[PDB]
């Protein structure tokens, strides 16, 4: 047998035939394609029903749909055969309703819910949608706007980036969500099949992962631009920083790639305003679910790692004496402990060593040394860096958590029809909609962690 989806297909690319077709005979071999399709549907064994047994009372109301959906082909196959053309155009133009109710409901990324026609009418808020969206949008807009003034550094790149990124992911997945509250979650009314849902659920994976890896690659910047010689040698660091950038989002688009390629699952989740990963039990469920969270966890622990040294480094650095750092090996030449083992005594200044002195990490002489400059600029940075940080931390680890915990579920967090529980669907949205904020507060990391702002924003204390 034929997979319920390309059945679908069938019944939709000759719905469109006959709509369009002039006479009789073009409607009759449209239909009758129409008629061997919902015949193989029927065989099909939808994956919302896959613990029914086929005697199942689930299962024979299954195949029931196709005798009907079979008996209105044939009331408009009895009409073609009757030459009655605008009839029969007539009578197949209802079986648009009919698929809905037999088929589109079984599509792949249809799991079971026991969510009421009731509790969807109150939970349908596409105003509400709207107003979260708009304010992501202009927060983001005005972060471009600030930047516009300010910008050249490879940090600023990632963080345009990352602006850019939460704009178009609150544009792109904002549309969807506020389509679906005002069409009161009926994916058909918006987009009949899957493919909505699908491109939805690669657009959450690209717009997840990305704010994520390229906050790790802010962490990075950071790390590298404090630990590493104070070179700024813009225009290629910029454009070494927009290629990050872009294999980024090549990344984030791969993984968002891997259910379309059968590793892992796009399904709708509840309130039924969206599509994600499956939080399933099934072998790529788990390993994509486990991809997603290990890859943004790791994203955020090795921002925490490199953050905390990278502060660390500018506290002890743009503190005490004058410190220079070697060009070479990075090495920082502290006048506060000197190289004692190589008779620089404690207390030497830089200005008093001698030239037949060489950085003790790497053996290169004093002409490679650099003095380590304060610049409010790092310090600015680094906090809009560990601001971001923060913002990730807050609002991603609980979802990357809880993905890797339903994903790993001692007894399976999924029933084998796809069903979860209403408290791990009201879980998810919930760390999902906590998730949503790190796409509204990066832009403001940027807005508020600047000097500016310090200075404008003082004589309030
Ligand atoms: C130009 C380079 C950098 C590559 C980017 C190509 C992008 C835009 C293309 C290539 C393959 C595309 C995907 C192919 C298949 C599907 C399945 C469909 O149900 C929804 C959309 C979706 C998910 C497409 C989204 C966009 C996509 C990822
Ligand atoms: O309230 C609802 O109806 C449920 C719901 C809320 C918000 C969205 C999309 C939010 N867009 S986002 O912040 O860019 C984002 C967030 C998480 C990921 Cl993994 C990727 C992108 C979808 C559904
Ligand atoms: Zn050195």
């Known amino acids: 047998p034929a997979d319920l989806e390309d059945n679908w297909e069938t019944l939709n690319d000759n719905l469109k035939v006959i709509e369009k077709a002039d006479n009789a005979a073009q409607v009759k071999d449209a239909l009758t394609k129409m008629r061997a399709a919902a015949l193989d549907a029927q065989k099909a064994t939808p994956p919302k029903l896959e613990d029914k047994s086929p005697d199942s009372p689930e299962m024979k109301d299954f195949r029931h749909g196709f005798d009907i959906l079979v008996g209105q082909i044939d009331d408009a196959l009895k009409l073609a055969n009757e030459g009655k053309v605008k009839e029969a155009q007539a009578a197949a133009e209802q079986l648009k309703t009919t698929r809905n109710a037999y088929i589109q409901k079984y599509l792949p990324c249809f799991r079971p819910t026991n969510i009421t026609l009731e509790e969807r009418r109150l939970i349908a808020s596409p105003w509400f949608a709207a107003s979260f969206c708009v ?94 010689p104070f070179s700024r040698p813009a225009v290629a660091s910029q454009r070494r920083a927009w290629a990050t950038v872009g294999l980024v989002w090549a990344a ?115 002409d490679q040394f650099e003095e380590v400059e304060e610049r409010d600029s790092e310090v600015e940075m680094m906090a809009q860096a560990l601001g971001i940080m923060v913002v990730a931390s807050v609002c991603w680890l609980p979802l990357l ?16 029809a796809g069903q979860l529980s209403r408290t791990t669907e009201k879980e998810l949205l919930i760390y999902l909609r906590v998730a949503t904020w790190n796409q509204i507060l990066d832009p403001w990391v940027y807005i508020l962690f600047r000097r500016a702002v310090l200075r404008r924003l003082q004589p309030r204390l």
């Open 252 to 366: 984030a688009l791969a993984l968002g790639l891997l259910p379309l390629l059968g590793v892992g699952r796009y399904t709708v989740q509840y309130p039924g305003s969206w599509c994600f990963l499956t939080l399933g039990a099934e072998s790529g469920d788990v390993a994509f679910g486990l991809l997603f969270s290990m890859l943004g966890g790791l994203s955020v622990g090795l921002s925490f790692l490199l953050n905390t040294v990278s502060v660390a480094t500018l506290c002890h650095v743009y503190h005490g004496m004058k410190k220079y750092t070697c060009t070479v090996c990075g090495y920082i030449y502290n006048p506060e402990d000197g190289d004692p083992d190589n008779g620089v005594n404690p207390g030497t200044d830089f200005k008093d060593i001698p030239d037949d002195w060489v950085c003790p990490l790497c053996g290169v002489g004093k």
């Open 401 to 416: 958590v809880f993905i890797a915990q339903t994903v790993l579920r001692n007894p399976p967090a999924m029933s084998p």
């Open 135 to 228: 304010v992501g949008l202009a927060s983001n807009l005005l972060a471009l706007s600030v930047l516009a003034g300010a910008r050249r550094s490879s940090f600023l790149t990632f963080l345009c980036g990352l602006v850019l990124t939460d704009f178009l992911g609150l544009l792109v997945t904002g549309t969807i969500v506020v389509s679906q509250h005002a069409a009161l979650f009926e994916w058909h009314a918006v987009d009949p099949g899957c493919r909505l849902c699908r491109f939805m659920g690669v657009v959450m994976i690209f717009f997840g992962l990305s704010p994520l890896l390229l906050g790790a690659a802010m962490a990075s910047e950071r790390y590298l631009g404090i630990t590493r």
